[PDB]
Structure 1
C-alpha cells in the first residue's frame, strides 16, 4: 500500500530560529509524528510560525489511505547566518544552489560565499550562489559571511561532497 510523502515549503531542511516552515503531506484528515509522537494538529499541512530548536528532529506523516511516511529530518540552528542547500552531496554536472540565510531575513550586505577558507563569490547585497555545473573542484567546506548593518557576521561551515 502506498506510503505517504512529506514535502517542505520552502525546501530547506536546515533553518534558523524564527523561520517559518510548512510541512505538507502527500497521500490519499491526516496524522503527524514529530520525534515518533503524534501531535495535535491534523490538517493536511503542519505549519511552524517561528521555529525554535525544540522544533528540530524527525517528522512523519500518514493518512487513512496510506502508510506511515518515511521520516524527514528538520534542523533548527541558532545564529545570525546559515548556509542552506537543497542537499549536500552532488554528482558531476549537477547544479549547486547555495543560500546565505540571515536571521529574521535581516538585510545583509557585502556577502561572500567561501569554499575551503577562500572567498569564492562576492555580492554587494545578499543573493544566492549558483554553480550551474558541479566539478570535483567544488567539494570542500563552505560557509557564508557578511555585514549586518555594521556587524561582521558569519555562518557555520557545511561540508559539500561531489561524488565520483
Structure 2
C-alpha cells in the first residue's frame, strides 16, 4: 500500500526566508532497492540524483513544487516550498494535518534574529493562552485548531506582523 516516496524537509519548514537552507529527502519502504533518484522542481527534472536534494541560500526562484520519484514506484506526492523576504515568517510543521497528528507553529525572525513579545493570532483573535510559550506546539491536533494564523513580534527593536497562513486539520472518515 505505501507505494510512493514521501518527501520530508529538514528543517520541516516549507516556508523559509531568502538565503536560508533546506534539505529535501526522498525516503520510502526499502522493498525495492534504490541506487538513484529523480527530482522534479516545478515539474522539470533536476540534475540531482542523490536521495537528498539540497537548497543553499534559497533564492525566490527556488520556491515552487518539489517531488521525487524512484524506479518501479509511483510519483511522490508534491511538496511546496516558498521563499519569503520579510521581518517575520510564520513557519509550520505542516500547513495541513490529519486530526490527531502534531501541529507545530513558529514565529521565525529575519536572519534568525530572536523575536520578543510574540503573539499568535488564530482568525484575527489573539491566542492568549499561548502567550507564555515562544512558539506553538500541539501534540494532538483538532479540527477546531483550523483557521488563519499569523504572528506579531518585536525584532531588533521594532514591531512587525507576519503574513497570515491558513491551516486546516481534517476530520478523518473511514
**Scaled by the length of structure 1, what TM-score is found?**
0.81
Partner in structure 2 of residue 37 of structure 1: 44
Q: How does 1:1-164 map to 2 (within 5 A)?
A: 2-27=3-28, 28=34, 29-64=36-71, 66-90=73-97, 94-120=101-127, 121-123=130-132, 127-134=134-141, 138-163=145-170
Q: Residues 55, 63 of structure 1: CA spacing in aligned structure 2 closer, same or farther, 3 A cutoff?
A: same
Question: Aligned partners of 1:157 and 1:135: how far apart in 2?
Answer: 20
Q: Is the 8 A contact 1:4 1:63 kept in 2?
A: yes
**Structure 1 unaligned residues grouped into runs of 5+:** none
**Scaled by the length of structure 2, what TM-score is found?**
0.77
**Structure 2 unaligned residues grouped into runs of 5+:** 29-33
Report which of the two has the higher share of strand. Answer: 1
Q: Is the 8 A contact 1:17 1:103 kept in 2?
A: no
RMSD: 2.7
Shift of 1:133: 4.8
Question: Aligned partners of 2:6 and 2:120: how far apart in 1?
Answer: 33
Question: Aligned partners of 2:75 and 2:140: how far apart in 1?
Answer: 36
Question: Aligned partners of 1:89 and 1:33: how far apart in 2?
Answer: 22
